[PDB]
């Protein structure tokens, strides 16, 4: 069942989905936890939260945007996290086989990709640390043509 909610202003919210919903919510949400196990799709426009924990299992599509102080992401297989436009301060991201992540860390980024999974970032954080295990990969995937791109420092420069 499709769902189209326009306008939510809550100071707490907890969502768990089990079947195949197609939900999209607008407003201002202080979300706390998210667990996905089906062919569910979800999108939220603005969230001003403090700590997110995401666990995605089978084939789920998530589309968030907003401000997050601390982010923890787990993708298991065939799962896609479209966390572009979600600007996070701390990120911990772990991906298993054939999963896709889009990351926008600002201050601190910590990532691990294990086997044939992909992490793409889209911002240059102040401290970056990435690890690769079997065939996974973390790629830059920025523009190359913007007039004011900024390069690495002594403190960002890690070699994948």
């Amino acid at each position: 069942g499709v769902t189209q909610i326009n306008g939510v202003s809550s100071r707490n919210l907890q969502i768990v989905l089990k079947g195949d919903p197609k939900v999209l919510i607008s407003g201002f949400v202080n979300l706390r936890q998210l667990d996905m196990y089906g062919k569910g799709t979800l999108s939220l426009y603005w969230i001003k939260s403090d700590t997110l924990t995401i666990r995605a299992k089978k084939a789920a599509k998530i589309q968030l945007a907003g401000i997050v102080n601390r982010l923890d992401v787990e993708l298991w297989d065939f799962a896609q996290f479209k966390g572009k436009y979600l600007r996070a301060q701390r990120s911990f991201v772990k991906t298993h086989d054939k999963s896709v992540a889009e990351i926008s860390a600002v201050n601190h980024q910590s990532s691990l990709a294990t086997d044939a999974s992909d992490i793409y970032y889209y911002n240059l954080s102040k401290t970056r640390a990435d690890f690769m295990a079997f065939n996974g990969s973390v790629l830059d995937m920025r523009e190359w043509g913007q007039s004011d791109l900024k390069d690495f420092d002594r403190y960002n420069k890690q070699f994948p």
Binding site: F92, K94, S110, L112, T114, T127, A129, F131, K157
Partner: protein, 173 residues
């Protein structure tokens, strides 16, 4: 067998190799295994490499020299010294309830913001390496101090070498 870069972050099946070279006796292989997976031989192996261990009360501390476990003036981790890091994971596997603090320290040469930023980067790199080996995110915290509280004298060469370090503290409860 064993993959030398971190074994793809998998726990290495170490005991079966000893019991295969000794069955290829079973009792002698079990005695050799139960000796080398004990805590005191792991502590002696960190003693054999350049890592110091201090136990006082119910607080435990590891001291790690950046001179051998990082590349020069960078937050990149030195890949030739992987036995020490694997032994650190093996020793830390024995306390699955405690919380961990990792702190980074440099010497006095340079500017203050430079020292603070380099310490913060190195502490985060070692915390990320700990987190990627299985330890949950709610058990960890990293902090970088500059030349804040030194343990040797910075006006002499060897003491200044001894001042650049990583501290790992953890509790029991």
């Amino acid at each position: 067998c064993f993959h030398p870069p971190y074994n793809n972050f998998q726990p290495d099946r170490r005991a079966v190799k000893r019991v295969g070279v000794d069955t290829g006796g079973g009792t002698v292989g079990l005695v050799a295994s139960i000796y080398r997976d004990s805590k005191r031989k792991i502590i002696r192996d960190l003693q054999k490499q350049d890592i110091q261990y201090v136990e006082y009360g119910d607080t435990r501390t590891l001291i790690i020299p950046t001179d051998k476990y990082f590349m020069f003036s960078s937050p990149r981790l030195n890949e030739i010294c992987y036995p020490g890091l694997n032994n650190v994971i093996r020793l830390l596997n024995f306390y699955p309830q405690s919380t961990i603090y990792v702190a980074g320290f440099t010497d006095n040469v340079g500017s203050r913001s430079h020292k603070r930023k380099l310490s913060q980067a190195q502490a985060e790199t070692m915390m990320t390496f700990l987190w990627a080996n299985g330890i949950a995110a709610k058990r960890l915290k990293a902090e970088g101090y500059g030349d804040k509280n030194a343990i040797s004298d910075n006006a002499i060469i060897h003491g200044s070498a001894q001042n650049r370090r990583i501290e790992i503290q953890w509790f029991t409860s």
